[PDB]
Amino acid sequence: GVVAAAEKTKQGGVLYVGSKTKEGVVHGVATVAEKTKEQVTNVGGAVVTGVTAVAQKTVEGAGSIAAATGFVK
């Protein structure tokens, strides 16, 4: 049983990033593989993958990830 449950219940600055760049090569979440069986990638949050990657107030509630892999049995 692969169960994920998420609940969010609500009973209700200055940020400068000045970037100047030449030749930016950026990889983020990279799974490189030869001779494989499973390649599972769950993003329950935030993958912010710039050359200028700004993430403000980003992942702010009830993330639930249930990964079950393999299980030859």
Shortest reach from residue 23's CB to a second copy, in Å = 5
Which segments are annotated as binding site for Cu cation? 27
Residues in 11-70 at the binding interface with a second copy, rule: CB under 8 A: 11-70
Number of shown-chain residues binding a second copy (CB under 8 A):
73
| Cβ–Cβ < 8 Å for 38, 68 | no
Cα(73)–Cα(11) distance, integer angstroms: 45
Shortest reach from residue 12's CB to a second copy, in Å = 5
Question: Within its chain, how far is the Cα of 34 from the centroid?
Answer: 23
